Every structure is written in structure tokens, then in C-alpha cells.
Design a protein around this ligand. Structure first.
Ligand SMILES: N[C@@H](Cc1ccc(OP(=O)(O)O)cc1)C(=O)O
Length: 108
């Protein structure tokens, strides 16, 4: 499997604030996204996704991706993935509990 660093949507140690600055671009389709390290939960990841909310308008959603020491990743413990690549593919197809499905890799 490709290392996560080879994936166009993986931005590593980009901060939550830096991810919001990027994803709040009004040109980005709803569901523009990247994956990053979590700043608050060591060893976890975050899925950061451009959104349009009925009340808040343009906003960025952040979903915490937990990593099992035994192997695998999840946002909801009932729905586990063997890789971040599998997780991104799954949430690209359907929201299944996110605000919106993933549509667009954050441009850079
Ligand atoms: N519901 C939380 C879930 C969350 C928690 C932490 C997290 O990592 P970081 O602090 O790097 O954004 C990402 C998502 C949120 O909207 O922030």
C-alpha cells in the first residue's frame, strides 16, 4: 500500500487553523477535504472537510480519526478501516454520519 505521505489529500502536521484557512476558500466544492495529524490527540488523525451549514454558512468540519494499536482506523467504532486510504474511499461514496461526503481533494 502507498504510504499516506504519497496521497494528495494527506497534509501531515498542518494545524487545524491552517486547514480551515485553506478549506474556507469559496471556490471549493462542499466536501473539499484533507487528512492531517490531530493536534489534540497524539497518534490520531483528523479529516477536515469544507461544509455549508444552514445556520453558520461556510464552515470547516473536523472529524477525529482514532488509530487502534491492534491495527485500523475509525471515526465511529462500528465502522473500522485497515487504512486511511480505505476510510477516505468509504466517506467519498456516502456521508454515512458526516455532514457531507468527501468530493474534492484540497488543492495546493
Ligand atoms: N467534534 C470535534 C472532533 C475533533 C477533535 C479533535 C480533532 O483534532 P484537532 O484538535 O487537531 O482538530 C479533530 C476533531 C471537533 O469538531 O473538533
Amino acid at each position: 500500500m502507498d504510504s499516506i505521505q504519497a496521497e494528495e489529500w494527506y497534509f501531515g502536521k498542518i494545524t487545524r487553523r491552517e486547514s480551515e484557512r485553506l478549506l474556507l476558500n469559496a471556490e471549493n466544492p462542499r466536501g473539499t477535504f484533507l487528512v492531517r495529524e490531530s493536534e489534540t490527540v497524539k497518534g490520531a488523525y483528523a479529516l477536515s472537510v469544507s461544509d455549508f451549514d444552514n445556520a453558520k454558512g461556510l464552515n470547516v468540519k473536523h472529524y477525529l480519526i482514532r488509530k487502534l494499536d491492534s491495527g485500523g482506523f475509525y471515526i465511529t467504532s462500528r465502522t473500522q478501516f485497515n487504512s486511511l486510504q480505505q476510510l477516505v474511499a468509504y466517506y467519498s461514496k456516502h456521508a454515512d454520519g458526516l455532514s457531507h461526503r468527501l468530493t474534492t481533494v484540497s488543492p495546493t
